[PDB]
Symmetry: D3
């Protein structure tokens, strides 16, 4: 039995029950090399898959691509192969002025501005992380020296209009999303990203443990397009954090 | 200065309290207050009975909510007008998972919004989640008490009967939306039903207020055994001792 | 057989098939004493229950608490015990300038700004009273000398944002409710309250007869304070009216 | 000076402020001839318009066509010319077993299974008649010796799937409507027709007085397609009732 | 042998027709039929006037719909019961784009579902799109008549007044949903407003029936000019010539 | 001047292209580019591999989208910022009708919006429709290739598993919304499932961009036979030859 998109078998995972799921296929090897005995397993489409060992236990690293749809495939196929815990690491845009580029955010719940979450549970259901994963992520983030924020994340199926960006081809935002960034800001929402609503709803409704930690690459109080110089330092810290969160989950 | 419209108390009456314990039943208010020091009756109007007491030397409010989001939302608003910023809900609940037993404790990590009042604060997409510090304090208090504690999702309904898929009713029928719903929530891992957490959590999380919910299981919708009087009595007492210890953990 | 919340049995109601349902537990005795042989039955939570006799027929008086959820419990449990007709008497805020403090309103339909109504019928279903109850309420209100208005009531799950109040802790109102008071005013809606949508929808979809009559205790458009003798008279007049409406319903 | 669709002027109405609005253009002359001085005014599309006199006062009779969209045009354009009261007469299918062919139904509220109502008020708003019109309709129906039922009407934008008819080209009903007739029956809904939700919602939200009376031409616990034998007698009774209800509304 | 309840015709009355032309106005039925051979009146009941005619030897129905999806849905259903499988809608419309002139033709490639009856056939997610062969035939016929033809999205409303964002009305009010809507559709590239296409196209695309819509522009909501009476007369005549030639292409 | 944030290309890199071919799989980009003249690798970042090539003398972009509306929406936006106005989507699909075989081609005439990202461009009422010229070009290219071609409605899902009503999954459960949904779409005449067309078509139709979708059938949900490797290889090669010939037809 080889899963349809990831191109791996259960035997390939050497008993892993925890996965680290970054978005970018290029981040997969980078995470895996922070652990022991990393091995490349497969690459198909946006899905690059490695295994490694953390404190003697097998751990998967698998990219998701951007968005809930491609995420949902990776999570499902990994769960078919025995993975039960999913630690998302990603980048994010802050919508509160006091959050700085380089800070870390651990999501306590997501605003479901996606479609895939609805393929698992009706809108009433909360897009919430597993409490142990969130706790582990907070501790790992703090222990790294990062400034960490816990709170609500707005999770959008688009980068552009659903995050109320106006520097676009049309410069238009549909009625639903006009004024939405200020509305979420006033409601205390910390940040925008694109996968947590799907991930957290899928997992919380399916017997899987999940959480999301993200490095802040932009503050929307300043600009819409992230600076490229900020990215590499923020990403290095984020992946150290998520591996330490994985360590806490396995202990 | 001003007296809020429903609760019948002033800011001065609260003696600087910034934390409230909010049970549903007005008769539980005095019982909670008497677990603390120097309890003082402030007011009773409608479903709202209000006491103050001292916990490690700090004033705490105890205020009942009544049943349901609407009455809850009034109490939370009016307490926040008077300086309360942290709200600890303690209440009874029905478990829907076979592994959860009468007498266990549940700390809600998020609520299924089967209510209306939450939508008066945030659109449905918004998560009905607790403040992380409150949830952490509640888990710690509940576990330290020696209880069996479950962290997870709660289904929060505007009705006791059809929205909890009860059929033992005058009409014996449930609107389409709720037919099969208990099994759906069970399959999704939802732990329990109650009637205030969706409103409370959504209101607070979208309004700069810290909230959480801990609940004592008084029925399991899947078990035929009837719980004995002693176990229910004990569960009620343990729930309020836990929420007072969670309040202690929140005080700064 | 004792119902779960109200703490009464069918025998306790002495054959009553009609209930008067105010919101405030303290008003229950005040209504019951306008009838013969009032007797306290139970008080639990927001539910205070009396029985009395009207023209020789037993009648229940039972408070509901604030909001549809607590109302829905009381109506269900009374219906399990044989009650088939429910007369609601309450306070309200008028939103039309021609309606004065002191006037009565008989609801002909409610705007469903609640949640519990949806636990009985989908939103398309009309929150309307039983025609005989509304007719009896109108006649009783007119016979008391009050100016009475028949019309639509906006029935909200909140006192604050859902009634478009801004003098609150946050001072915000969610998008759905911004501009809503003016919208209802322009649509001819008379007043706000917090239980009629649940009550009327529940009863109209469950074979129970229900209606609502309410005393105007504020006008959201008028500046002045009403004097005490008027407020006191309005409360007394409201409960005199509901009892006379009950008399009309019983033969 | 003529309205866009109806082809009539204010002068043509000769002071009428009340309209009788049947669906079928052929019922217009029949209604007008129950009154004094009937005069043909115009016929365009589904809109046939007459005037007549009732107790010395002008009344307009104007067909609507089938459905909310065509109804909404007629109501609007008549209101532009000074009409304020709208009496709907139509045919209907009963869904309760006890409601027989030839009975009359006066709608106390409509299930909004239409689209046009939403162009006047959001779904929460009740599709409710004016209380004076409903009272006049009940009185006219009862005084005529008819068997009369007061209650909720399911008002559908289709004759076929939205009324859960299966004897159709596809034999399919979309998920929303599968099982819907039994749900309405269990909820105590009396009947199906196609215009009341739009009419009542439009009028109740726009300062216009409206009500709906209908003659039962089929009982849906029996069959789907009305028998032709009984149509003429039921329609004659219905229009006699609606004209009397208009008499009761004249000031 | 049955006579359909509203249209008052039998299958035999249609002489084997599998295509219908469906204008809105009963008075246009005879006008369309007389562009074909051997037109014969079949029935008139309510808004439904029904003729039969022959086009290149093949029977065709012409049946009015009335205004709106509800009455349209009845005519389509009852014709389909009698063997009709292809439905060509010809109607009037209001353009909302400045580059579309009074007298141009529009062939709808999809409709904005601002109706209710479409929902009685398919949930809102389903696209209100024409059959591709019908749309192709309509485009070709329109071009061959010398008209300027636009292919694009049509906003299909259950009202003439608020749902087309008209304020020159008895109340002068437009419900929140429709406030600003005309500009929103304009900015989204929508060409025009009418009142039947959403129902027609959704019903047919979800029921195994082929449908399309072609319209002549009788007003432009952005232009202050008032068109000639001769231009309007010519537009009506051209629209029905076009729909008959589109039918010919479908029957070839 | 600017380099777009996700795609990592500039306007100058596109050498004047106003048309893009947008497959799903980054690995298909080079294969499509090599069917044209002078293919040039431009960038690869995340799921976005970008090439340029020349078709009859004109520059054409080829850019992968990844799986799903969200990643598609980014590519489309960023290409539009760089001057692209016409988007030709080629992808794989699962047929749900028995008459549609593996190796056949589908050209979508409208999409069932079972996605979220479409709603970020237009409300649900708006049709997820292709540009008529692109759909016409795709039908012609597909038919001219000798393939069997189906025009019709496509169900476009944000999931591969529950939203396509697959039960052989980790949980084996499908949420209520999607229980029975494949049969409902089948009965409504829907041809196929994929995961990007609703977003793409809605975004473009509401933004002044021309788009269409063509897909090769790689599986039929109603067939038990597994297609052989040669048939799948032929299908993938035919799909990309077809999309390139469709692009040729669109060039002006
Ligand atoms: N301002 C930002 C910054 C980052 N992200 C996240 O990173 C990817 C899109 O750039 C997506 O994976 C998304 O989660 C975002 O959405 N918004
Ligand atoms: N099975 C159960 C058990 C408890 N509750 C809680 O108790 C009150 C209503 O009885 C409400 O406060 C509600 O939260 C419930 O709803 N359902
Ligand atoms: N302006 C007003 C006036 C009165 N009410 C009624 O009083 C209770 C809340 O105060 C509720 O029970 C409600 O019936 C209200 O909601 N709004
Ligand atoms: N079973 C029935 C009977 C009657 N009607 C009403 O009559 C017309 C449709 O035949 C429509 O005008 C509609 O109001 C209906 O909808 N359903
Ligand atoms: N601006 C316009 C122009 C025309 N239409 C068409 O007009 C009929 C009702 O007037 C309807 O049948 C509709 O097709 C419209 O709705 N809006
Ligand atoms: N049965 C099928 C076949 C194909 N697809 C398409 O292939 C990619 C994911 O497999 C996605 O691009 C999707 O469009 C699908 O979703 N379902
Ligand atoms: N660029 C913008 C256009 C419209 N609204 C905005 O807030 N910004
Ligand atoms: Cl309690
Ligand atoms: Cl139990
Ligand atoms: Cl009261
Ligand atoms: Cl026409
Ligand atoms: Cl014009
Ligand atoms: Cl591909
Ligand atoms: K992706
Ligand atoms: K209450
Ligand atoms: K009509």
């Amino acid at each position: 039995k080889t899963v349809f998109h990831l191109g791996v078998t259960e035997a390939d995972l050497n008993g892993a029950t925890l996965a680290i799921i970054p978005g970018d296929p290029a981040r997969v090897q980078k995470i895996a090399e922070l652990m022991d005995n990393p091995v490349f397993l497969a690459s198909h489409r946006e899905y690059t898959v490695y295994r490694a060992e953390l404190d003697g236990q097998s751990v998967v690293v698998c990219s998701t691509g951007i968005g809930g749809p491609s995420t949902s495939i990776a999570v499902e196929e990994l769960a078919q192969l025995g993975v039960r815990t999913f630690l998302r690491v990603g980048t994010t845009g802050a919508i509160q002025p006091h959050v700085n580029v380089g800070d870390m955010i651990v999501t306590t719940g997501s605003v479901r501005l996606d479609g895939a979450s609805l393929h698992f549970a009706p809108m009433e259901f909360p897009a919430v992380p597993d409490f142990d994963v969130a706790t582990a992520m907070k501790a790992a983030a703090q222990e790294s020296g990062a400034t960490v924020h816990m709170g609500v994340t707005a999770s959008s199926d688009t980068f552009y209009p659903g995050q109320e960006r106006y520097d676009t081809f049309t410069g238009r935002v549909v009625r639903r999303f006009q004024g939405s960034m200020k509305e979420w800001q006033d409601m205390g929402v910390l940040n925008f990203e694109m996968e947590s609503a799907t991930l957290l709803t899928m997992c919380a409704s399916s017997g899987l443990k999940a959480g999301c930690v993200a490095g802040v690459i932009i503050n929307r109080t300043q600009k819409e397009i992230p600076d490229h110089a900020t990215l590499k330092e923020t990403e290095a810290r984020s992946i150290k954090v998520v591996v330490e969160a994985a360590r806490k989950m396995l202990k």
